[PDB]
Subunit: 209 residues, 3 copies
């Protein structure tokens, strides 16, 4: 009945579930705003070392902009965010997954860019070519085709694709491994990675303080 659920069962992990499976967790206002407030809170929760983000039901997400705020909130966390893509990641849903630090896909997952200049398409146009190279990003976005989970793994859109039944535990297993590193160590890795993408030059980035 809540639009975004939080699960703190596992030590050091916050499992966040987009919860309107009826509408394929479409990123309407009443989903993205509570998500934004939760992401803000999680930033200050030092018991949480890793965030796993997933969708209730059949889809991950079918996707006055709040998506850009959410994207930057994900990036602002000192915790790594693992997207557990359990089903359809479409438009804003694909962009949300690309805003996470790691993606793992269920066999059931597929990915589509879709949709008017939106935060979603701007985010996609920045992040997708940097994930999978310009050739594949360009034709996927220009044809608007579906990318299945096997292809997503092959081309490096996700890190791994696993049986639907194994998805969350794979993510929990990865989170558990990440817990073994120090909180400031992991944070620095995440921060250098995202700022490395924006860096003007190699030398400038190496001079970062």
């Amino acid at each position: 009945t809540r639009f975004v659920l939080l699960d703190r069962s596992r030590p050091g992990v916050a499992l966040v579930t987009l919860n309107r499976p009826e509408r394929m967790n479409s990123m309407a206002f009443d989903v993205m705003v509570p998500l934004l407030e939760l992401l803000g809170d999680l930033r200050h929760d030092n018991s949480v070392r890793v965030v796993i983000l997933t969708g209730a039901g059949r889809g991950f997400s079918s996707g006055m902009e709040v998506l850009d705020n959410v994207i930057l909130a994900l990036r602002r966390l000192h915790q790594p965010v693992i997207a557990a893509v359990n089903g359809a990641a479409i438009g804003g849903g694909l962009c949300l997954a690309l805003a996470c630090d790691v993606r793992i896909a269920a066999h059931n997952a597929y990915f589509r860019a879709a949709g008017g200049l939106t935060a979603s398409e701007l985010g996609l146009s920045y992040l997708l070519p940097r994930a999978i190279g310009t050739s594949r990003a360009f034709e996927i976005m220009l044809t608007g085709r579906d990318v299945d989970a096997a292809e997503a793994e092959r081309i490096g859109l996700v890190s791994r694709t696993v049986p639907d039944d194994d998805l969350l535990e794979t993510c929990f297993e990865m989170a558990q491994r990440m817990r073994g590193f120090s909180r400031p160590g992991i944070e620095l890795t995440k921060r250098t990675l995202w700022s490395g993408l924006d860096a003007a030059s190699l030398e400038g980035h190496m001079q970062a303080e």
Copy 2:
């Protein structure tokens, strides 16, 4: 007898053929300048939704700079450009293909960087690592080796590799699919993609107007 041919057989599509098969469509002045003027015209033709670019004969192209003007003209089109790489794409020819939005290769195609600071090598050095990653771009350009069509598909230099006999119709099939999207929608996708490559940061790009 014309050095660049235009074919408007298929609705919404302009098939452009580099036509000096004798010299493997080498990007001499008398080819690139008519191509440049045609690309300028196509920009204003609202009957054309998609451009397919290919070479006459055995090669795609064997490649006071006009290549840079052509590169920027391709990019300036609101229409997606599909390179139908039917054979040898060498030097300026590879750079021309990389300046298109999507590449499809015939079984017959192969790719080589070749050649004096040229627009070709500058364009390549920017575009190839962004297409296929720095490791592969660097050694392909530093060894100057041939890359066959099967490898090109594997590493994401092209989106697909198909039988020689099926090349153009695969491209027409993709163009036909792209026609289904609105003209301003497709345009925005192409524009965000190319400007995304040049963007200084994620956040700056998301603030684009």
Copy 3:
């Protein structure tokens, strides 16, 4: 007994061996400083066309910063540098390999990011996502897992993976091929490639002089 060895057996090639196999050629001060001085000398040696960099013993390298100076010295050479990754490339060792122009791996090799804001992690965070895309770079660096030589080749972290016994000769064969191009031609290719990575835009890069 020297910490960095130079081998000029093969014409046009300088084979540089990191020589403290006892400590897995860890990039301590007494290794990196002589390497830095050697890289400086090699820059002025016009008999040397290609540099091959490798490690003595079982590892490539297990890795007040001098690593950043070494990184920029490698990049400053007009000669291509081929990393012959003969074993463990860990932390600064992986970053060193990523600072070379081409990587070839022995069957024996594996790669790990490891480690406090260091030149190593900054260099990695810039170079790894540009080599293999953000999805794989991010999870490899955030999980700190080992990447074996077969995977490294598959994802384009290295150009090729070969039997341990064949590693150096594969590199010598590639160097021999690179020798066939002119010294200023090869130099320009290397320079456009590295500056292309830092370029602000396609058009700006094409206007380079």
